[PDB]
Design an enzyme around this catalytic site. Structure first.
Site, PDB file in Angstrom:
ATOM      1  N   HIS A 186       0.823  -1.205   0.000  1.00 59.84           N
ATOM      2  CA  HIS A 186       0.000   0.000   0.000  1.00 59.84           C
ATOM      3  C   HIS A 186       0.863   1.264   0.000  1.00 59.84           C
ATOM      4  CE1 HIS A 186      -3.958   1.986   1.639  1.00 59.84           C
ATOM      5  NE2 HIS A 186      -3.662   2.354   0.407  1.00 59.84           N
ATOM      6  N   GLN A 511      -4.977  13.576   2.824  1.00 56.63           N
ATOM      7  CA  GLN A 511      -4.014  13.377   3.893  1.00 56.63           C
ATOM      8  C   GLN A 511      -2.670  13.874   3.389  1.00 56.63           C
ATOM      9  OE1 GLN A 511      -4.204   9.739   6.123  1.00 56.63           O
ATOM     10  NE2 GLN A 511      -5.884   8.925   4.872  1.00 56.63           N
ATOM     11  N   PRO A 569     -16.063  16.778  10.386  1.00 56.29           N
ATOM     12  CA  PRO A 569     -17.001  15.665  10.203  1.00 56.29           C
ATOM     13  C   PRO A 569     -17.291  15.442   8.721  1.00 56.29           C
ATOM     14  CG  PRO A 569     -17.735  17.034  11.999  1.00 56.29           C
ATOM     15  CD  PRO A 569     -16.531  17.724  11.416  1.00 56.29           C
ATOM     16  N   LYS A 570     -17.740  14.242   8.366  1.00 53.50           N
ATOM     17  CA  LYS A 570     -17.957  13.873   6.969  1.00 53.50           C
ATOM     18  C   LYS A 570     -18.839  14.872   6.219  1.00 53.50           C
ATOM     19  CE  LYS A 570     -18.050  11.000   3.352  1.00 53.50           C
ATOM     20  NZ  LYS A 570     -16.626  10.571   3.353  1.00 53.50           N
ATOM     21  N   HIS A 573     -17.097  18.443   5.948  1.00 56.31           N
ATOM     22  CA  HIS A 573     -15.965  18.371   5.028  1.00 56.31           C
ATOM     23  C   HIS A 573     -16.370  18.439   3.558  1.00 56.31           C
ATOM     24  CE1 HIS A 573     -13.493  15.460   2.509  1.00 56.31           C
ATOM     25  NE2 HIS A 573     -12.749  16.551   2.573  1.00 56.31           N
ATOM     26  N   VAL A 574     -17.412  17.701   3.195  1.00 54.80           N
ATOM     27  CA  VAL A 574     -17.909  17.725   1.826  1.00 54.80           C
ATOM     28  C   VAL A 574     -18.497  19.096   1.507  1.00 54.80           C
ATOM     29  CG1 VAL A 574     -19.529  16.733   0.176  1.00 54.80           C
ATOM     30  CG2 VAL A 574     -18.406  15.265   1.854  1.00 54.80           C
ATOM     31  N   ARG A 575     -19.324  19.593   2.420  1.00 53.07           N
ATOM     32  CA  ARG A 575     -20.032  20.852   2.230  1.00 53.07           C
ATOM     33  C   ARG A 575     -19.100  22.059   2.133  1.00 53.07           C
ATOM     34  NH1 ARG A 575     -21.484  23.568   6.579  1.00 53.07           N
ATOM     35  NH2 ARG A 575     -21.555  21.563   7.690  1.00 53.07           N
ATOM     36  N   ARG A 576     -18.082  22.107   2.988  1.00 56.22           N
ATOM     37  CA  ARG A 576     -17.194  23.268   3.044  1.00 56.22           C
ATOM     38  C   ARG A 576     -16.291  23.377   1.818  1.00 56.22           C
ATOM     39  NH1 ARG A 576     -12.871  21.760   7.871  1.00 56.22           N
ATOM     40  NH2 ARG A 576     -11.748  20.103   6.750  1.00 56.22           N
ATOM     41  N   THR A 594     -11.661  11.735  -1.581  1.00 48.55           N
ATOM     42  CA  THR A 594     -11.656  13.188  -1.440  1.00 48.55           C
ATOM     43  C   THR A 594     -11.917  13.898  -2.766  1.00 48.55           C
ATOM     44  OG1 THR A 594      -9.242  12.953  -1.437  1.00 48.55           O
ATOM     45  CG2 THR A 594     -10.294  13.476   0.654  1.00 48.55           C
TER      46      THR A 594
HETATM   47  C1  LIG Z   1      -4.597   5.871  -1.470  1.00 51.23           C
HETATM   48  C2  LIG Z   1      -5.716   5.014  -0.927  1.00 51.23           C
HETATM   49  O1  LIG Z   1      -5.506   4.102  -0.128  1.00 51.23           O
HETATM   50  N1  LIG Z   1      -6.958   5.335  -1.394  1.00 51.23           N
HETATM   51  C3  LIG Z   1      -8.167   4.634  -0.992  1.00 51.23           C
HETATM   52  C4  LIG Z   1      -8.963   5.558  -0.004  1.00 51.23           C
HETATM   53  O2  LIG Z   1      -9.322   6.733  -0.602  1.00 51.23           O
HETATM   54  P1  LIG Z   1      -8.667   8.338  -0.263  1.00 51.23           P
HETATM   55  O3  LIG Z   1      -7.197   8.186  -0.470  1.00 51.23           O
HETATM   56  O4  LIG Z   1      -9.486   9.218  -1.150  1.00 51.23           O
HETATM   57  O5  LIG Z   1      -9.071   8.385   1.255  1.00 51.23           O
HETATM   58  P2  LIG Z   1      -8.540   8.392   2.739  1.00 51.23           P
HETATM   59  O6  LIG Z   1      -8.406   7.049   3.360  1.00 51.23           O
HETATM   60  O7  LIG Z   1      -7.562   9.519   2.861  1.00 51.23           O
HETATM   61  O8  LIG Z   1      -9.863   9.064   3.643  1.00 51.23           O
HETATM   62  C5  LIG Z   1     -10.704   9.886   2.967  1.00 51.23           C
HETATM   63  C6  LIG Z   1     -11.963  10.025   3.829  1.00 51.23           C
HETATM   64  O9  LIG Z   1     -11.687  11.105   4.722  1.00 51.23           O
HETATM   65  C7  LIG Z   1     -12.818  11.872   4.839  1.00 51.23           C
HETATM   66  N2  LIG Z   1     -12.469  13.211   5.385  1.00 51.23           N
HETATM   67  C8  LIG Z   1     -11.375  13.882   4.910  1.00 51.23           C
HETATM   68  C9  LIG Z   1     -11.004  15.096   5.424  1.00 51.23           C
HETATM   69  C10 LIG Z   1     -11.951  15.717   6.300  1.00 51.23           C
HETATM   70  O10 LIG Z   1     -11.593  16.894   6.842  1.00 51.23           O
HETATM   71  N3  LIG Z   1     -13.045  15.149   6.777  1.00 51.23           N
HETATM   72  C11 LIG Z   1     -13.403  13.883   6.271  1.00 51.23           C
HETATM   73  O11 LIG Z   1     -14.460  13.376   6.575  1.00 51.23           O
HETATM   74  C12 LIG Z   1     -13.444  11.908   3.435  1.00 51.23           C
HETATM   75  O12 LIG Z   1     -14.753  12.355   3.570  1.00 51.23           O
HETATM   76  C13 LIG Z   1     -13.255  10.424   3.060  1.00 51.23           C
HETATM   77  O13 LIG Z   1     -14.389   9.768   3.531  1.00 51.23           O
HETATM   78  O14 LIG Z   1     -10.128   4.842   0.387  1.00 51.23           O
HETATM   79  C14 LIG Z   1     -11.051   4.535  -0.640  1.00 51.23           C
HETATM   80  C15 LIG Z   1     -12.251   3.834   0.020  1.00 51.23           C
HETATM   81  O15 LIG Z   1     -11.803   2.738   0.762  1.00 51.23           O
HETATM   82  C16 LIG Z   1     -10.391   3.654  -1.751  1.00 51.23           C
HETATM   83  O16 LIG Z   1     -11.206   3.587  -2.893  1.00 51.23           O
HETATM   84  C17 LIG Z   1      -9.046   4.294  -2.214  1.00 51.23           C
HETATM   85  O17 LIG Z   1      -8.371   3.371  -3.017  1.00 51.23           O
END
Ligand SMILES: CC(=O)N[C@H]1[C@@H](OP(=O)(O)OP(=O)(O)OC[C@H]2O[C@@H](n3ccc(=O)[nH]c3=O)[C@H](O)[C@@H]2O)O[C@H](CO)[C@@H](O)[C@@H]1O
Length: 700
Positions: A186, A511, A569-570, A573-576, A594
């Site tokens: 990963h 991230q 919060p989920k 985060h989407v809304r802002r 994201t």
């Molecule tokens: C590089 C990697 O491993 N990517 C995977 C990751 O996506 P991706 O790399 O997009 O996601 P992350 O694991 O970083 O987490 C993203 C999550 O964080 C949430 N969030 C983010 C910031 C915030 O301030 N508040 C908040 O709620 C987003 O809404 C989302 O739900 O998980 C997806 C679902 O399992 C998989 O399809 C992708 O393959």
């Protein structure tokens, strides 16, 4: 002086490098039958039993190994590893600390301690111990590669280029020596490894499953050849540890419920227990069958249950992520087994046949970076449930303050009913039936700013519930996690996050690990060409903020140029994301989930497709969206496309309006159509198998 058990111990070590794991055990046991107090034999046998997945039994021998030789610090550390794998992090931690205390020079225990900190989010503590481990034993590939990832997480780019060189040379040296690479599958997407190196890494880890299932000695499962027992329906099994409040469920939760019950019978196999969240509820309520495999610890019994359900296509939604139990797929309880959505890379494993992707994410000329056969979805393999989770963001309104669409925003299910109570509502027209209501700066509008500026939870205008965007978790915690749809009207202002009310806001809510020195420099170039712009990042984690800032200063950016905000919060985060003007995507590893979030807010995302799967997801999302001009072929085109959006306000308006419409019109967020396209692909797989053929590429 050598005994009789001491020679058996030597012979058993040879059988360990031969790969003959099973014979190695027999020779160790025979040694213990000759010498019951042989500490090394107990330690070694336990180290082999640990590979086999016989943890409880291995643990037993680690105890004996230590009772005999109490200075066996090496035995302590390995017992910790065992306990750690047994989810007893407390006891594992004790083993490492005890080992270090017996021998402060023992480098491996320091590394293992750092691993516990790393898994527990304690990055600086992990970094500190990894350096200690490395200061003791400089030739320590595991410690170096893990530290490298820790530094990656918090954007510590000290000697980055030199570090990327050593990472590659380490994996190269290890692969050439047929040893297990210290880079996790990963993580291989983050380093400038070979495309071949990455797949080889995935392969080695895939074979670790084979070792853990060969101990079960299970005969191959007899797979179905027709849909007779299934009543003409295709039995699809979704295996994930993420059925609940996890990003995965946020994307695909609707999908099982939208399957065709005339041709498909859905089986959801959960690798994790019920967390009570609505995500778990929905899948359980909509999937034809929900199976909690978290209560079936043994992979043997679990794989039996899958086979007993008569699954034709078993879907891996985990790959090499947290909570994965790939030993299930290694046992092959289903004739067709595909990767999907969860893991953004190849499994590199024999027991995985297809990998559900698309023409954009995985073009045919780079199919050699996968072990599985490509299985293209029509437009994009990626899906999001934003349409269902946040229907309140489908329409917005604004407030003027002498007309922009991201300074002060109002969303709500009953928003249009609320605007009808207001006297002077101006209706600004969008273009390519759509409209954006604007509120003039009056006593009602000033009452809302009052609530925001004061920091009030909510107010009441004409009997309507006007909520503060920062306090959604205090009004309806369910609505904040996205488990429910907000039953109030939510106010979202730039002032809430410290954003200037007249600047081009470039956002990236990924991230921080997805950023490399190349990307920050690329972004700095953009910011320098757009003087009145800010880069909006997240404290994800917060410790990475001083690092990102420091490097920004060194590239020539004043501190005000980059604005940070906490993780929200989920729902928030989407809304802002509505507040931003343009989202700058990370080329090293695209914003997958994201990326779907920013697009749902009608925010244009600028991406640059790499060669890895992870680095091409955003591009695939955008092609499906219908915005090819937001895709760049190189760094220069990336910065150009971005700068144009921040300087040509009319062009920005067109593209923003384009995303705002094509997030609904395009099939990007259409879960129903996606499911059908997924069903079509499922049948292509089954027909190919029922024809007696072995898995092969699927290009529609
Ligand atoms: C590089 C990697 O491993 N990517 C995977 C990751 O996506 P991706 O790399 O997009 O996601 P992350 O694991 O970083 O987490 C993203 C999550 O964080 C949430 N969030 C983010 C910031 C915030 O301030 N508040 C908040 O709620 C987003 O809404 C989302 O739900 O998980 C997806 C679902 O399992 C998989 O399809 C992708 O393959």
């Amino acid at each position: 002086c050598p005994t009789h058990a001491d020679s058996l111990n030597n012979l058993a070590n040879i059988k360990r490098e031969q790969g003959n794991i099973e014979e190695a055990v027999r020779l160790y046991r025979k040694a213990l039958e000759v010498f019951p107090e042989f500490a090394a034999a107990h330690s070694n046998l336990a180290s082999v039993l640990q590979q086999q997945g016989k943890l409880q039994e291995a643990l037993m021998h680690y105890k004996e190994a230590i009772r005999i030789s109490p200075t066996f610090a090496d035995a302590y550390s390995n017992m910790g590893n065992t306990l750690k794998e047994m989810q007893d992090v407390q006891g594992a931690l004790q083993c490492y600390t005890r080992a270090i205390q017996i021998n402060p020079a023992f480098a491996d225990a320091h590394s293992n301690l750092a691993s516990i900190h790393k898994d527990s989010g304690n990055i600086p503590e992990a970094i500190a111990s990894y350096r200690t481990a490395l200061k003791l034993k400089p030739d320590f590939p595991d410690a170096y590669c893990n530290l490298a990832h820790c530094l990656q997480i918090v954007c510590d780019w000290t000697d980055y280029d030199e570090r990327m060189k050593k990472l590659v040379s380490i994996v190269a040296d290890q692969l050439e020596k047929n040893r297990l690479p210290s880079v996790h599958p990963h993580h291989s997407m983050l380093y400038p490894l070979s495309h071949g190196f990455r797949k080889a890494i995935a392969e080695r880890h895939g074979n670790l499953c084979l070792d853990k299932i060969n101990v079960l000695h299970k005969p191959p499962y007899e797979h179905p050849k027709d849909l007779k027992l299934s009543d003409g329906r295709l039995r699809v099994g979704y295996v994930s540890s993420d059925f609940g409040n996890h990003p995965t469920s946020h994307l695909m939760q609707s999908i099982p419920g939208m399957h065709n019950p005339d041709k498909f019978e859905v089986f959801c196999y959960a690798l994790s227990p019920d967390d009570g969240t609505n995500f778990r509820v929905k899948v359980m309520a909509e999937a034809n069958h929900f199976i909690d495999l978290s209560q079936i610890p043994c992979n043997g019994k679990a794989a039996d249950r899958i086979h007993q359900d008569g699954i034709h296509i078993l879907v891996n939604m985990n790959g090499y992520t947290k909570g994965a139990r790939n030993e299930l797929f290694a046992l092959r309880p289903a004739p067709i087994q595909a990767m999907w959505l969860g893991y953004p890379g190849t499994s590199g494993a024999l027991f995985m046949d297809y990998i559900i992707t698309d023409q954009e994410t995985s073009p045919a000329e780079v199919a050699e970076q996968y072990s599985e056969k490509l299985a293209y979805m029509p437009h994009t393999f990626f899906i999001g449930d934003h349409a269902n989770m946040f229907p309140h963001l489908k329409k917005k309104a604004v407030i003027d303050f002498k007309i922009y669409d991201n300074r002060i925003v109002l969303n709500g299910i009953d928003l249009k009913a609320f605007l009808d109570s207001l006297p002077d509502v101006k209706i600004v027209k969008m273009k390519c039936a759509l409209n954006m209501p604007v509120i003039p700066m009056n006593t009602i509008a000033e009452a809302v700013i009052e609530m925001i500026n004061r920091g009030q939870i909510q107010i009441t205008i004409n009997g309507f519930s006007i909520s503060n965007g920062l306090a959604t978790t205090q009004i309806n915690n369910k609505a904040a996690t996205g488990e429910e749809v907000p039953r109030t009207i939510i106010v979202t202002t730039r002032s809430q996050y410290g954003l200037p009310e007249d600047a081009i806001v470039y956002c990236n809510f990924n991230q921080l690990y997805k950023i490399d020195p190349s990307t920050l420099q690329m972004w700095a170039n953009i910011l320098k060409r757009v003087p009145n712009s800010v880069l909006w990042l997240l404290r994800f984690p917060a410790v990475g903020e001083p690092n990102i800032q420091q490097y920004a200063q060194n590239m020539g950016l004043p501190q005000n140029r980059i604005i940070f905000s906490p993780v929200a919060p989920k729902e928030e985060h989407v809304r802002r994301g509505q507040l931003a003007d343009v989202c700058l995507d990370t080329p090293l590893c695209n914003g997958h989930t994201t990326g779907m979030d920013v697009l749902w807010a009608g925010t244009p995302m600028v991406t640059m497709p790499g060669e890895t799967l992870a680095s091409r997801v955003a591009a695939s999302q955008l092609t499906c969206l219908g915005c090819l001009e937001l895709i760049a072929k190189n760094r220069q085109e990336y910065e150009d496309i971005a700068v144009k959006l921040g300087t040509d306000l009319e062009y920005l308006k067109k593209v923003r309006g384009k995303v705002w419409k094509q997030r609904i019109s395009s099939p990007l967020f259409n879960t129903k159509q996606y499911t059908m396209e997924l069903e079509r692909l499922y049948l292509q797989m089954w027909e190919h198998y029922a024809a007696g053929n072995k898995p092969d590429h699927m290009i529609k």
